[PDB]
């Protein structure tokens, strides 16, 4: 009985709906009656063209602000090069108006879309914090298609204020259910960058989203890491189609590319899911993604089955998002139990790294305590080590059930001698596994060079339920 979009460019939005059955299955969700009505999404970027013919209808002032110039108007700053078109393109992916004879449509074409202008100026900690913490009780979902530079040699994450914003958000946002923070995993693929060296994507408070090309391959710009949760389509080679969305100066573009285009789609799908069940917590949302994401069709050299029978890849997480499956499962979903946290300091003495280091440890996952965990969610391996050439290192974490998470792959461009100072490598691959048993940490020198260093701290942090 459902009538699909009549927008001129909808037919070119292959990722939303397609005969080829190689899409995000969004139409299936619309058919179930979900279009994002009543949900507020904010794009933290370089601004939003609120008067764009395909955005005005859904624009929400209450979900917008200009942190760069300190005013409530997020209108982009126009320039010959059109530098500030990025935010507008992302916004259109989420909530471009439907059936209005203009361009295409957003995943959640009935959702309210706002924008925070915060990338066009000096991006300080305070800037990020005010953006991430803007109207926690009005805005449901925050989408961020930006982050630390992808030079493949830096390790960076949010500063104090930003962290506090993330924490206040998942604790108090949406009346206690927690703000949903969707993040783009990164474009450092060509520099062999690792998204676990990015504190924003690596955070358990954000759903890090990777990309897949139209033909189902890992894009050239893609970064691999164990913190990524799921994937959505984006650009690839010149024979593969790209993302169709709203462009600066009230235009329509068919060439929105890179990791930037993936997060917004995820945000849109999550918006449909919230409409299907407004009582979902920030953790419930991550559970839904893990359970409904599809590997099938996506090609990767590292698909592996975790302890609970699910396929995971460091390039795709649990696979492609399935809007239809998301809204379906959302309806009968029972809120998960309170989040427990189990801290386990492993080392009783420093360990020399040398060519290879292996650390084994049998844990009881807080058995007998109030924070005992039998069903794992996120897991962090907080490491503190020194090394002469950081990029030569490769770190792996093996769960008791045999799931092997690569916390850090070699980064040839990383010649830093500063090692890692209590960096929290995170993995989503052992989600739902029983964390008790023997955990194994592997640190290896992937180079022929005679490198040297010392591992001084290895704290295992388990999040989950019983």
């Amino acid at each position: 009985v459902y009538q699909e979009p009549t927008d001129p460019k909808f037919p070119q939005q292959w990722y939303l709906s397609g005969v080829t059955q190689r899409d995000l299955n969004v139409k299936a969700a619309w058919a179930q009656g979900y279009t994002g009505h009543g949900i507020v999404v904010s794009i933290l970027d370089d601004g939003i063209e609120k008067n764009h013919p395909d955005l005005a209808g859904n624009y929400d002032p209450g979900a917008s602000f200009d942190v760069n110039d300190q005013d409530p108007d997020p209108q982009p700053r126009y320039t010959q090069m059109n530098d500030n078109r990025h935010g507008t393109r992302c916004a259109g992916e989420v909530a471009a108006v439907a059936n209005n004879g203009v361009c295409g449509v957003g995943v959640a074409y009935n959702a309210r879309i706002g924008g925070v202008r915060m990338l066009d100026g000096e991006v300080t900690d305070a800037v990020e914090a005010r953006s991430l913490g803007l109207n926690p009780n009005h805005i449901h979902i925050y989408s961020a298609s930006w982050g630390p530079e992808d030079d493949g040699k830096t390790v960076d994450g949010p500063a104090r204020l930003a962290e506090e914003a993330f924490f206040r958000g998942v604790s108090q946002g949406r009346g206690g259910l927690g703000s949903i923070f969707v993040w783009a995993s990164g474009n450092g693929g060509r520099e062999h960058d690792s998204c676990n060296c990015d504190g924003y994507t690596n955070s358990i408070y954000t759903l890090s989203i990777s990309s897949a090309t139209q033909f189902g391959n890992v894009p050239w710009y893609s970064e691999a890491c164990s913190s990524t949760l799921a994937t959505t389509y984006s650009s690839g080679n010149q024979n593969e189609k790209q993302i169709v969305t709203t462009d600066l100066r009230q235009k329509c573009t068919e060439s929105h590319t890179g990791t930037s285009a993936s997060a917004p789609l995820a945000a849109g799908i999550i918006a449909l899911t919230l409409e299907a069940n407004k009582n979902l917590t920030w953790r419930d949302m991550q559970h839904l993604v893990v359970q409904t994401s599809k590997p099938a069709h996506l090609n990767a050299n590292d698909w592996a089955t975790n302890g609970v029978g699910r396929k995971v890849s460091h390039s795709y997480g649990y696979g492609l998002l399935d809007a239809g499956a998301m809204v379906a499962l959302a309806q009968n979903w029972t809120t998960v139990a309170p989040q427990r946290k189990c801290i386990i300091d492993i080392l009783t003495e420093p360990k020399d790294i040398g060519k290879r280091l292996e650390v084994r440890k049998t844990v009881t996952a807080c058995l007998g305590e109030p924070n005992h965990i039998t069903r794992l969610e996120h897991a962090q391996a907080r490491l503190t080590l020194s090394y002469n050439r950081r990029g030569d290192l490769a770190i792996h974490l093996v769960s008791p059930m045999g799931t092997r998470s690569t916390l850090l792959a070699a980064r040839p461009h990383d010649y830093s001698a500063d090692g890692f100072n209590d960096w929290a490598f995170m993995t989503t691959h052992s989600w739902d596994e029983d964390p008790s048993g023997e955990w194994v940490l592997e640190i290896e020198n992937t180079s022929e060079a005679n490198n040297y260093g010392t591992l001084t701290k290895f704290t295992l942090v388990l999040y989950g339920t019983a």
């Binding site: 370089d46 930006w146 982050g147």
Partner: peptide, 4 residues
């Protein structure tokens, strides 16, 4: 830093 921070880049698009």
């Amino acid at each position: 830093x921070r880049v698009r």
